[PDB]
């Protein structure tokens, strides 16, 4: 969330939103999934990804397409 959708939270006088990671799978197979929370509304990345960055886009790009959506 962090960048264009963190000011846009700000200035939709919302809550921080919450940036949580999960990892799962083998040491050497592991799969990374990001899930942004905002005022209540989750935003979870898409799977299938080997790198923490990669998962925290997917989300950001979540809850991107959503906020378009509701716009």
Known sequence: ????????????????????????GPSHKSLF??????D????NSLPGFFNRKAAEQSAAEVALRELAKSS
Not at 14 to 22: G, N, R
């Open 1 to 24: 969330f962090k960048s264009r959708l963190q000011e846009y939270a700000q200035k939709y006088k919302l809550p921080t939103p919450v940036y949580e990671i999960v990892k799962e």
């Open 40 to 43: 209540g509304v989750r935003y």
């Open 33 to 38: 999934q990001s899930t942004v929370i905002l």
